[PDB]
Design an enzyme around this catalytic site. Structure first.
Site, PDB file in Angstrom:
ATOM      1  N   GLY A   1       0.864  -1.003  -0.063  1.00 16.46           N
ATOM      2  CA  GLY A   1       0.004   0.054   0.086  1.00 16.46           C
ATOM      3  C   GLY A   1       0.771   1.306   0.005  1.00 16.46           C
ATOM      4  O   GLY A   1       1.859   1.555  -0.950  1.00 16.46           O
ATOM      5  N   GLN A   2       0.406   2.275   0.880  1.00 15.74           N
ATOM      6  CA  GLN A   2       1.202   3.445   1.136  1.00 15.74           C
ATOM      7  C   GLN A   2       2.618   3.352   1.535  1.00 15.74           C
ATOM      8  O   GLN A   2       3.192   4.426   1.795  1.00 15.74           O
ATOM      9  CB  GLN A   2       0.297   4.671   1.814  1.00 15.74           C
ATOM     10  N   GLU A   3       2.697   2.390   2.386  1.00 18.14           N
ATOM     11  CA  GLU A   3       3.962   1.983   2.948  1.00 18.14           C
ATOM     12  C   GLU A   3       5.228   1.752   1.907  1.00 18.14           C
ATOM     13  O   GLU A   3       6.249   2.205   2.192  1.00 18.14           O
ATOM     14  CB  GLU A   3       3.962   0.721   3.678  1.00 18.14           C
TER      15      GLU A   3
END
Ligand code: GDP
Length: 169
Positions: free
Chosen positions: A67-69
């Site tokens: 994801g946004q990681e």
């Protein structure tokens, strides 16, 4: 009692441990098996999605990757990096592969030992441990001590043998 005795012993020293993987890999279920009849403290951090779990002398830093990681990129003093892989998620396995190499590239993890838990191996037709290792190309990692261990976090089968590999280091 056997997993316990080796844990209690593994904790004769304080160990710094990272536990990473995609959401729903089985990271929390694993830190729960580790936590039976033990003293546990958990704590969010500042400016990051990292959860600090302390189980009797061992300081686990944990978070989800993906994801946004993925759109971000501590390591220093970590003796062991535990990557939990969901043996049944063939779709997103490649996301774990890309992350795993982005971590080991940082000089802070030069001395961290690598533990892959091939989790959810109780599920039928899941990927084998041999396929996980070769897909993640674990034999190509020559600058780090590594081990892959099949496990089932629900029952804790395999978790004592991954702990033995860690303690052995
Ligand atoms: N069948 C099976 N399910 C598992 C295993 N380990 C964890 N799970 C399940 O998968 C779900 C997600 O695991 P969780 O530990 O919450 O993953 P996390 O997001 O990485 O912390 C939970 O519903 C667990 O009950 C396993 O070895 N086998």
């Amino acid at each position: 009692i056997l997993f316990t005795r080796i844990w209690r012993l593994f904790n004769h020293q304080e160990h710094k441990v990272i536990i990473v993987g995609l959401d729903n890999a089985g990271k929390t279920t694993i830190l729960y098996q580790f936590s039976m009849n033990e003293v546990v403290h958990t704590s969010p951090t500042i400016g990051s999605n990292v959860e600090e779990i302390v189980i009797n002398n061992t300081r686990f830093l944990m978070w989800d990757i993906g994801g946004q990681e993925s759109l971000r990129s501590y390591y220093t003093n970590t003796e062991f990096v535990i990557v939990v892989v969901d043996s049944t998620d063939r779709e997103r396995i490649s996301v774990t592969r890309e992350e795993l190499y982005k971590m080991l590239a940082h000089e802070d993890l030069r001395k961290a030992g690598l533990l892959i838990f091939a989790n959810k191996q109780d599920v039928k037709e899941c990927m084998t441990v041999a396929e996980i290792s070769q897909f993640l190309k674990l034999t190509s990692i020559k600058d780090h001590q590594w081990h892959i261990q099949a496990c089932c976090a629900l029952t804790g089968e395999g978790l004592c043998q991954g702990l033995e590999w860690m303690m052995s280091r």
